[PDB]
Amino acid sequence: EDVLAKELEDVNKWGLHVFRIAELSGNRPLTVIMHTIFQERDLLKTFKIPVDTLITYLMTLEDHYHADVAYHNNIHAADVVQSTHVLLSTPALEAVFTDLEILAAIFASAIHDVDHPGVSNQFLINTNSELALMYNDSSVLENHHLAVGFKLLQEENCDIFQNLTKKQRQSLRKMVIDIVLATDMSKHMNLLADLKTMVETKKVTSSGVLLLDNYSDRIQVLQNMVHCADLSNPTKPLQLYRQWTDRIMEEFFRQGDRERERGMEISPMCDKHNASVEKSQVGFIDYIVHPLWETWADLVHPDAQDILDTLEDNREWYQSTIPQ
Amino acid sequence: MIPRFGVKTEQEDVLAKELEDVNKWGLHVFRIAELSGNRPLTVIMHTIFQERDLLKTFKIPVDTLITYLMTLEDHYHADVAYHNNIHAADVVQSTHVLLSTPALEAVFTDLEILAAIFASAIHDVDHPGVSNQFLINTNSELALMYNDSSVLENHHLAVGFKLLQEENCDIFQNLTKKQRQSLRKMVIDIVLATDMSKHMNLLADLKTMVETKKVTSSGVLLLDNYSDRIQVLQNMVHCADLSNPTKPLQLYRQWTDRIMEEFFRQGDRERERGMEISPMCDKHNASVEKSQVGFIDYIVHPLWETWADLVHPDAQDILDTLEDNREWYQSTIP
Amino acid sequence: MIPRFGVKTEQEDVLAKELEDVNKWGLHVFRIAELSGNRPLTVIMHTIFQERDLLKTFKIPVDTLITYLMTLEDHYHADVAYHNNIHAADVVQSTHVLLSTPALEAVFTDLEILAAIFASAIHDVDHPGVSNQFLINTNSELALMYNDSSVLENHHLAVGFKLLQEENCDIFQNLTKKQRQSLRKMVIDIVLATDMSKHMNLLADLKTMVETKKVTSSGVLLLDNYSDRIQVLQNMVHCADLSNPTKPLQLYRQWTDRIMEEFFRQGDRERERGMEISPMCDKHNASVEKSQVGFIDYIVHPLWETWADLVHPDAQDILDTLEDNREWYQSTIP
Amino acid sequence: EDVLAKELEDVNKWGLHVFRIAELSGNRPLTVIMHTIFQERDLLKTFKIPVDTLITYLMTLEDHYHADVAYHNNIHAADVVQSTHVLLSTPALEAVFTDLEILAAIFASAIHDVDHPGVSNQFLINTNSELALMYNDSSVLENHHLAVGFKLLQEENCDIFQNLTKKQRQSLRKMVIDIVLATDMSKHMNLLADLKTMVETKKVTSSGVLLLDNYSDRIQVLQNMVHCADLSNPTKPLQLYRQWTDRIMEEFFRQGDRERERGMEISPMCDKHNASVEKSQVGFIDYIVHPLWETWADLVHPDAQDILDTLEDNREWYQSTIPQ
Numbered sequence A, D: 001e002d003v004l005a006k007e008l009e010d011v012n013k014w015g016l017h018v019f020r021i022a023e024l025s026g027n028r029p030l031t032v033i034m035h036t037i038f039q040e041r042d043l044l045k046t047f048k049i050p051v052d053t054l055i056t057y058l059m060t061l062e063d064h065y066h067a068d069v070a071y072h073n074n075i076h077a078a079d080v081v082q083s084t085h086v087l088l089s090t091p092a093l094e095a096v097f098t099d100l101e102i103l104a105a106i107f108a109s110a111i112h113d114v115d116h117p118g119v120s121n122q123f124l125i126n127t128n129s130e131l132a133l134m135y136n137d138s139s140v141l142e143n144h145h146l147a148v149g150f151k152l153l154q155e156e157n158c159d160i161f162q163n164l165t166k167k168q169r170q171s172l173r174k175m176v177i178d179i180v181l182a183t184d185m186s187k188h189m190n191l192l193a194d195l196k197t198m199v200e201t202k203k204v205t206s207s208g209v210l211l212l213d214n215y216s217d218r219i220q221v222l223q224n225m226v227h228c229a230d231l232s233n234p235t236k237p238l239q240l241y242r243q244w245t246d247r248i249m250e251e252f253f254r255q256g257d258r259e260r261e262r263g264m265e266i267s268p269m270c271d272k273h274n275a276s277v278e279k280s281q282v283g284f285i286d287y288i289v290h291p292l293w294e295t296w297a298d299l300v301h302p303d304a305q306d307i308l309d310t311l312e313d314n315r316e317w318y319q320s321t322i323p324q
Numbered sequence B, C: 001m002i003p004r005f006g007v008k009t010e011q012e013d014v015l016a017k018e019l020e021d022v023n024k025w026g027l028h029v030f031r032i033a034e035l036s037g038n039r040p041l042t043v044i045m046h047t048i049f050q051e052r053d054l055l056k057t058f059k060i061p062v063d064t065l066i067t068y069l070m071t072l073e074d075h076y077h078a079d080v081a082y083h084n085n086i087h088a089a090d091v092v093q094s095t096h097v098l099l100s101t102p103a104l105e106a107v108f109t110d111l112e113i114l115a116a117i118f119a120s121a122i123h124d125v126d127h128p129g130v131s132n133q134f135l136i137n138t139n140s141e142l143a144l145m146y147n148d149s150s151v152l153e154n155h156h157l158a159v160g161f162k163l164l165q166e167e168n169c170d171i172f173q174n175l176t177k178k179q180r181q182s183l184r185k186m187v188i189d190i191v192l193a194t195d196m197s198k199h200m201n202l203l204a205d206l207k208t209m210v211e212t213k214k215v216t217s218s219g220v221l222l223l224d225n226y227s228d229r230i231q232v233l234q235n236m237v238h239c240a241d242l243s244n245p246t247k248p249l250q251l252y253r254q255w256t257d258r259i260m261e262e263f264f265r266q267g268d269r270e271r272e273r274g275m276e277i278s279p280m281c282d283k284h285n286a287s288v289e290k291s292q293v294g295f296i297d298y299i300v301h302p303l304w305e306t307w308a309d310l311v312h313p314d315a316q317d318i319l320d321t322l323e324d325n326r327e328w329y330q331s332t333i334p
């Protein structure tokens, strides 16, 4: 408990020992990290959130992440929350976002993978699952994460937004939806193209912070921020990154074992018999993660330079462990 | 031509004579609704399935088709003045006429044709007669389920597909897996395009296609990729949905009465609830005639002019009727 | 027009004068439905809540009550002839009168009163105008969700509670968890008891209670456990649901006209689908009068005679009206 | 492969090594045991069930049992299926049930706990969970297990009943609902009362098997049969029984840990700090399992004598471990 309170002092740092916090909290990393961030940002007072209500909702939300899913679980959620909390604190964005925008980004991060079954949208579509039927094969999981995250507010003593005005609730809800729907990898190339356009036309205020003077630009930055947090594993200290790689490959390989036993075509990087884990990480960095983080780094220059350096060091480490 | 080789009733002969106009713009769809005992969608869909030989092509058991159509029609609301089974029947039949345009002869496969007419049939099913924004503002279960995003269009799809699971309702039971996967994708792409939030981008793409328009030796449109094929089918069904002002005036006037009854009821619900009354939903501060002229000038004529260019000159009489009706409504403005 | 300003409109004053009968058997509920612009459930629930001081007792904000009532009423189907918002308003008002019977003076708590009146309000919400068996035989999604077991009664409850989550609809927001759990249990026990499959066991239990009937110091029923208290509330609401033949004949006949319209519509759907036509649903082979005498002799009279024994002699005039109406229907049979 | 085939030779015996089968099948005990039983009973030929359709439905059903739940998982499902299969085979029921009734009992067994979250109905009710709202706090999970088991027939190549006639489908669906809704412990006392009445008025055919000449009696026996299978753990060899007790207590204590952290009242026998594992097992046997199994044993006398003897031996063993 002393040891937990001590790990939690690193909540404003890139590279928080999130797996240690998961162990020390009795598998409550999302609850303890969200509560710590809400206290640090004074969101309970700003939004008149009863503390019992916040903890009941966080326990409820965390309980709806699957303990049997190796990657898309409550530890990933806690990690995305905490990574978004650090990116919101970047000097280039100081005083740019309102308290409601900050609440939206953090809540969006907390709920963004809730009730993830550990299989892809394409798996749910191919099996004619009830989820794919309900969501017309379109951002199936991302739509579901949102509906679950909002629906859990109706459980006993779970409505953390009970003291927001209707106008606050409507704005918070629209921003959360816009953010989580943007975590669908189908939207990655269009999000990145828009971030690059903003970098090429970047304006700063006289205080040297980003100028975002319309909803479109404000929500683009929040979408790309939470997308960066979601795609942040290769930017973390290598000891953390390697644990995340082991977890995503366990999850992918289990999907491929389900595809194989069902006579389905095995999804890319899901065949444990035809795998190159290290080459796949170098490819993920070269094609997805480095392009995104290099553009983010230009938007907030020079705030993210150490994150980009770590990304490049970690890319060289995976390259160096690709077998013969 | 309905063959006759036996004596039949009054009502039967009149219904049969009206159904002979199923391949024409300006079908007497309200008369068919009355004559069929409020089964316009069932009788019009069945007639079009026969006209296109879809039962034979897709091995649809006739009992299954009739059961599915009556089930689908039963999930349109009898108390909704505009977004009901008569509108569904009208969009199906309008789409059926647009598929037959000379510029599209032999362009679409039987499965694409099936997708366009099935999408038309289901595109407003279980419509409550209020807008997405009303469902969003009340924190409706539907708005929660669909994250405030194309709420009703998502729902229409889910319902239209779910109704295939009722007893003897699976009209696709004899499709192969590959046909079902392709049909499903096309139907989703078409119905989600009927959200008016999508209209400006749809119209932009149709405009781009007109400018880069390629024709075959036959003088018929060249559509050689899914993106172009689905864009035409999306715009085709959206034209069918927005076709009321292009119809013979006696039809157009009834469609206007119905949409304004539905809008005014929504405004009466907003008023009683202390909500902001939605645009053209306030019966105390409405200009039905000005709104139709605005609807034509800013939505319907821009779409239909662009459609008429894609299929030039096939849609000239439709555009002429639209321009005449616009002048009629204009002339009734105080 | 002269704007209104804190005085009733003439139509509102006429509605107020009709609502002076809210404590009487035989309220002009159809006239209330017309005068209120098809808001009988909202206006009658609001009147009864004010009369029983339930807003102060349960700290229910008036805007929340009105919002929830309009929402609930809006989820009754305007196209369904019998199982609609007028039927809900009638069961509410009938329950309200039964709760006031001298034999029950000071017996029930405010929470039990709230449970009986709320249960009555929600007991048929979102009724599609067809029977459980119709929904089971068509493999409807509702029958799938509820395992063919009290399908509509389960749905009415789920919808009545789910609508509390719409914007400014949670009328129970100020109740304690203990109050909410008790209210919820009582409401569920009552509405599930409106399934006619439960009628014989409910009546068997009411008879047992009449036989072992104990009064108190003041000649009022003694109910000293949950089992007997809920039994009486279940039978009370079931009598209210089955009250139409106990009303003045001008009201009873409007109810018979509506149930037969609803039943015949179900039979027309069964006929067109090739299904067996349900009992009393064939408009070509029905005896409305024989069916009402049967309904009374086998279902309504045995229930009301037993209720009348429980509350002796408070229900004598209700039982006399029932017997007079039974004689009237019998005398109209060829 | 060869070891699995060897263990599955025991599929017609009480006391099958179901945990070993779970390990050898790669956590597919439900799929392999159902497939074996369908093949043994010739149900694929009788009901024209395509073998690929059967295996796809079984793996889909098995996948909807939660891998993180210690007791109410695919191993429990496999166990209840196999236990029902042995009970249907009893001499007293030879040629009594039709192939459709046998199919109904084995299908109901397979689906009877699907999508169990590892918490009780009361926990779902107290939290205002979406399931409890849908089901009006009434047989919440039992209704849900049925809805799920039927809905999964609609996934791609899952409709194992596609070649039944309409009348066969209507009959099967009614029987399956009747059987699963009877696994609700709220129905146990009325079910046992009716089984006792049947034993008191027991008739046998001219061939000496149970005489059941109406639906009410036939469904009564199938309901009690699957209820016996569900409550069969204390009747198994003690090494199997103790493994089941370890699992149900892990599941209960996890529920109590969730109640405690939420500030809820801890459910009976869910408090790991105030537990009587051994006294609870003896109470369970004395008040529920022994009255049920003694009555079943009367109904099929003497077929269940060894099962009843094992139950009484295990009851004495646990009694011997209860502190003073």
Ligand SMILES: COc1ccc(-c2ccc3c(c2)COC3=O)n2nc(C3(C(=O)OCC(C)C)CC3)nc12
Pocket (backbone or CB within 6 Å): A183, A184, A185, A230, A231, A233, A234, A241, A244, A245, A246, A248, A268, A269, A280, A281, A284, A288
């Ligand atoms: C620690 O390494 C990882 C962490 C996280 C993810 C990841 C997987 C799926 C999603 C996301 C991230 C965000 O939204 C998703 O749907 N991946 N994904 C890969 C590879 C992959 O296949 O990436 C391509 C995908 C994301 C299109 C194998 C290389 N590695 C990693």
Ligand SMILES: COc1ccc(-c2ccc3c(c2)COC3=O)n2nc(C3(C(=O)OCC(C)C)CC3)nc12
Pocket (backbone or CB within 6 Å): B194, B195, B196, B241, B242, B244, B245, B252, B255, B256, B259, B279, B280, B291, B292, B295, B299
């Ligand atoms: C015969 O006249 C009409 C027919 C149909 C429609 C219509 C209404 C709503 C939707 C659609 C069409 C398609 O998707 C929808 O959500 N309207 N709508 C208008 C006006 C209107 O407000 O237009 C709104 C635009 C954005 C649809 C008053 C002029 N008139 C008519």
Ligand SMILES: COc1ccc(-c2ccc3c(c2)COC3=O)n2nc(C3(C(=O)OCC(C)C)CC3)nc12
Pocket (backbone or CB within 6 Å): C194, C195, C196, C241, C244, C245, C252, C255, C256, C257, C259, C279, C280, C291, C292, C295, C299
């Ligand atoms: C004014 O006359 C009526 C009013 C109300 C009802 C009624 C119908 C269905 C339900 C209930 C009441 C309560 O729960 C139900 O499911 N019936 N039902 C009949 C007949 C009938 O079939 O009654 C037998 C039913 C109740 C099983 C045709 C004679 N008449 C009337």
Ligand SMILES: COc1ccc(-c2ccc3c(c2)COC3=O)n2nc(C3(C(=O)OCC(C)C)CC3)nc12
Pocket (backbone or CB within 6 Å): D183, D184, D185, D230, D233, D234, D241, D244, D245, D246, D248, D269, D280, D281, D284
């Ligand atoms: C290996 O021993 C066990 C196995 C299974 C079960 C069990 C638990 C819950 C349900 C069922 C069985 C069937 O339907 C249910 O809702 N129990 N339950 C107990 C105790 C218990 O609490 O029993 C009372 C329950 C059955 C209400 C601790 C003593 N032990 C065992």
Ligand SMILES: [Mg+2]
Pocket (backbone or CB within 6 Å): A112, A113, A183, A184
């Ligand atoms: Mg995700």
Ligand SMILES: [Mg+2]
Pocket (backbone or CB within 6 Å): B123, B124, B152, B153, B194, B195
């Ligand atoms: Mg629409």
Ligand SMILES: [Mg+2]
Pocket (backbone or CB within 6 Å): C123, C124, C152, C153, C194, C195
């Ligand atoms: Mg009812």
Ligand SMILES: [Mg+2]
Pocket (backbone or CB within 6 Å): D112, D113, D141, D142, D183, D184
């Ligand atoms: Mg169970």
Ligand SMILES: [Zn+2]
Pocket (backbone or CB within 6 Å): A076, A080, A112, A113, A230
């Ligand atoms: Zn994620």
Ligand SMILES: [Zn+2]
Pocket (backbone or CB within 6 Å): B087, B091, B123, B124, B241
């Ligand atoms: Zn439409």
Ligand SMILES: [Zn+2]
Pocket (backbone or CB within 6 Å): C087, C091, C123, C124, C241
């Ligand atoms: Zn009723």
Ligand SMILES: [Zn+2]
Pocket (backbone or CB within 6 Å): D076, D080, D112, D113, D183, D230
């Ligand atoms: Zn079980």
